[PDB]
């Protein structure tokens, strides 16, 4: 008999189509019966397909843009638009071909492009060490991006490592 709505909200029911609409909804929720989460939140407020999970803001390690929409899946919480070149369910890793600490405070030293030199890097790989960013250099090739010959060595463009 009472309105099937949270926080003493009034409701409207159209018996012809039988749809009931709560006038108000608690913060973070949306829908006619506040049965879902608003964009920017995730959960299952009424336990429609699992235990009750109150809507809460997307948890993406501050690696999402507040000006974007659809930042995370409204049911699971999976982060969908990670920035600063981060990735993963919680924007907790770097995208393929990038290195650094996605959880770093400063966005600058988060996930940067490996930018491996195609001549000095083994098999022309684009990935690199997750922490140092060091690309897998060919024989006698040095430098993070493998773009410099070791002293006393030449012709990086050989594609077999510098030589002499």
């Amino acid at each position: 008999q009472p309105c099937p709505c949270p926080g003493g909200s009034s409701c409207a029911i159209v018996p012809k189509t039988k749809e009931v609409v709560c006038t108000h909804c608690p913060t973070g929720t949306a829908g006619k019966r506040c049965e879902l989460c608003d964009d920017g939140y995730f959960g299952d407020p009424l336990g429609s397909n699992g235990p009750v999970r109150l809507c809460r803001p997307c948890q993406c390690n501050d690696n999402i843009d507040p000006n974007a929409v659809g930042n995370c899946n409204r049911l699971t919480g999976e982060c969908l638009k990670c920035i600063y070149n981060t990735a993963g369910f919680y924007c907790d890793r770097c995208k393929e071909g990038f290195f650094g600490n996605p959880l770093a405070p400063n966005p600058a030293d988060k996930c940067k492009a490996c930018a491996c030199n195609p001549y000095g890097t083994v098999q022309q790989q684009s990935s690199c060490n997750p922490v140092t960013g060091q690309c897998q250099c060919l024989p006698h090739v040095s430098g993070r991006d493998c773009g410099t010959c070791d002293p006393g060595y030449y012709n990086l463009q050989s594609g077999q490592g510098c030589e002499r």
Binding site: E19, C22, T23, D38, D39, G40, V69, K81
Partner: protein, 263 residues
């Protein structure tokens, strides 16, 4: 005869506009689409049809203003459609996609898709047309290089209209009579208008909290705000806040458009 239409999660709201005034007490739901997060809105003046973009599925759909059952026209190969504009003369739609990074054009029923632009786009969002003069305008809130761009509706003559002093240009609107292009910026916290012919001179209205979308009706601007959770009506010239509407269900407001009684 003319109505205001705005988007919220799971619905599209509707409220009458009687002589530049919002009939707040008469605000009723236009359509309920529970599973969707409606973002962009547009209105076809010849057939009286409302168009929208949904970032949930994602999809682009339409429904007649008078009764009409909601129908989806596009689902495939879609990223994050956040703005949609129409060519009521040529019978086509235009939209921004901030995921696939492009602006596409297609027939009213969604067929014969064509990627109009797909380079130099990072976060396109707002987009409007001026069918009579054949011009297209859009915003790209690219954090590093935000911009307001224009091009012919046919895809030629693309160029940047505004680049400096822009933060987060989320939506824009064009008024044919005054030849005025206005946008709302959630970064600089203001609304700016300009004549595309003389791009250098910008009228500015300050004090906008967090504008998302905007539409116009003569001298008045109507924008949706994320901070205040309301539709705000502003007058260009006097730079005054005419009125505000707070929908009872205080969820995030998105796109906004005006349903004209005739073209």
């Amino acid at each position: 005869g003319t109505h205001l239409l705005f988007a919220q999660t799971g619905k599209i709201e509707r409220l009458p506009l009687e002589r530049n005034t919002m009939k707040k007490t008469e605000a009723k739901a236009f359509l309920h689409i529970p599973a969707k997060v409606i973002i962009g809105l547009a209105f076809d003046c010849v057939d009286k049809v409302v168009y929208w973009t949904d970032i949930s599925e994602p999809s682009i759909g339409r429904a007649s203003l008078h009764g009409g059952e909601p129908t989806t026209i596009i689902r495939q190969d879609l990223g994050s459609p956040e703005g949609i504009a129409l060519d009521h003369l040529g019978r086509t739609i235009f939209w921004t996609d901030s995921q696939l990074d492009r602006i596409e054009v297609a027939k009213m029923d969604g067929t014969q898709r064509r990627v109009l632009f797909d380079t130099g786009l990072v976060n396109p969002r707002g987009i409007v047309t001026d069918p009579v003069r054949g011009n297209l305008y859009w915003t790209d809130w690219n954090r590093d290089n935000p911009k307001i761009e224009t091009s012919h509706m046919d895809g030629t003559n693309r160029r940047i209209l505004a680049q400096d002093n822009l933060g987060l240009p989320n939506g824009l609107t064009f008024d044919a009579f005054s030849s005025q292009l206005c946008w709302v910026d959630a970064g600089t916290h203001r609304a700016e208008c300009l004549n595309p012919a003389q791009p250098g001179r910008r009228k500015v209205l300050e004090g906008l909290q967090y504008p998302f979308a905007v539409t116009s009706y003569g001298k008045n601007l109507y924008y949706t705000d994320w901070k205040t959770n309301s539709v705000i009506a502003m007058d260009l010239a006097i730079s005054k806040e005419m009125d505000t509407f707070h929908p009872h269900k205080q969820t995030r407001l998105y796109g906004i458009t005006i349903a004209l009684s005739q073209c």
